[PDB]
Each structure stands twice: as structure tokens, then as C-alpha cells.
Paper text:
The cells grown in rich medium (MTSVY), produced a single variety of T4P which were very similar to the adhesive Aap pili previously reported for S. islandicus LAL14/16, with a slightly improved resolution (3.9 Å versus 4.1 Å). We denote this type of T4P as mono-pilus (see below). The mono-pilus has an asymmetrical unit containing a single pilin with a helical rise of ~4.95 Å and a helical rotation of ~104.8°, displaying a slightly right-handed 7-start feature, similar to the Aap pilus of S. islandicus LAL14/1. The REY15A mono-pilus structure adopts the known archaeal T4P two-domain fold, featuring a long N-terminal α-helix and a C-terminal globular Ig-like β-strand-rich domain. In the mono-pilus, the inner helix of a mono-pilin S0 interacts with outer domains from pilins S+4, S+7, and S+11, resulting in a total buried surface of approximately 873 Å2. In the mono-pilus, the outer domains are densely packed. The outer domain of S0 interacts with six other outer domains, exhibiting an extensive total buried surface area of 1,574 Å2. Three out of those six interfaces are unique (with the other three related by symmetry), with buried surface area ranging from 236 to 300 Å2. Previous work has demonstrated that a closely related mono-pilus exhibits remarkable stability under extremely harsh conditions, such as boiling in GuCl or pepsin digestion. This can be attributed to the fact that the inner hydrophobic helices of the mono-pilus are completely encased by the outer domains, which are further armored by heavy glycosylation. Under conditions of nutrient limitation, S. islandicus REY15A cells predominantly express tri-pili, although mono-pili and flagella are also present at low levels; however, in the rich medium, the cells exclusively express the mono-pilus.
Numbering used by the authors: 13 to 143
Write the structure that this text describes.
């Protein structure tokens, strides 16, 4: 009599476990699709006198936040409007840890930027240097 009881106990347990795994997979699907996608729209004028980006990031997910930036192969620090709101907006972020002598000489030229986002993906930014 033990064989049948064991069979049904294991069958019910397997049904429960399979349902749990399938539900977890679908929940992971939902979590990943709305994970937060951030891209660059338009240019990003960068000031050289003090250092203040004017990037225009368009995000279609969770309200993430920038955690850092890379300038000339150096780890910078970001302060300002650091909280990335949902929806396309004009953001005024301020960089840090750059000497105001190298960047000042490049007024009117273009460089390439990267923002260190909190959801694990970086965004490449093209910039115009301005006074």
C-alpha cells in the first residue's frame, strides 16, 4: 500500500514545485522587461568653466539613478539632479574630480561620455564642450 501513497505524495509535490518554478520564471520575465531602459536623445552640452552636463536621457522603466561617470579614463563623481525620473527630460548633472585646466582648452570640441547607472547598464553620451 506504501507504493501508491508515495506515488501520489511525490506527484502532488512535483505539481507544487513545477507551478512554483513556472510562476517564478514568469515573474522574472516581468521584472526584466520593465527593468529600466535608458538611452540618449539629442546632444549634451558640457560646461568647461565648472563642469555641468546638460544631457537629455529618455528612460522607459524604473526610476534609476546615475552613480558615476568616466571622463578621460578617470573615475568621476556625480552630484546634482541625480535621480532619473521616468519620461524624457532635460537633466542638469554636475561632474567632479577633473582639473579645470585640461578641459578648458577644448572649448568648442566634441568628446564622448559614459554615465554609471544604478540598474547595471551604462549609457554612452556624446557631448559638445561649451564655456
Amino acid at each position: 500500500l506504501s507504493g501508491a501513497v508515495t506515488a501520489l505524495i511525490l506527484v502532488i509535490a512535483s505539481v507544487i514545485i513545477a507551478l512554483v518554478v513556472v510562476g517564478f520564471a514568469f515573474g522574472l520575465f516581468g521584472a526584466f522587461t520593465g527593468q529600466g531602459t535608458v538611452t540618449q536623445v539629442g546632444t549634451a552640452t558640457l560646461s568647461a568653466g565648472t563642469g555641468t552636463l546638460t544631457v537629455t536621457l529618455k528612460n522607459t522603466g524604473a526610476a534609476t539613478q546615475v552613480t558615476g561617470a568616466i571622463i578621460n579614463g578617470n573615475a568621476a563623481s556625480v552630484s546634482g539632479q541625480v535621480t532619473i525620473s521616468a519620461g524624457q527630460n532635460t537633466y542638469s548633472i554636475s561632474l567632479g574630480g577633473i582639473s579645470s585646466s585640461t578641459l578648458q582648452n577644448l572649448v568648442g570640441s566634441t568628446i564622448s561620455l559614459t554615465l554609471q547607472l544604478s540598474n547595471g547598464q551604462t549609457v554612452t553620451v556624446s557631448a559638445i564642450i561649451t564655456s
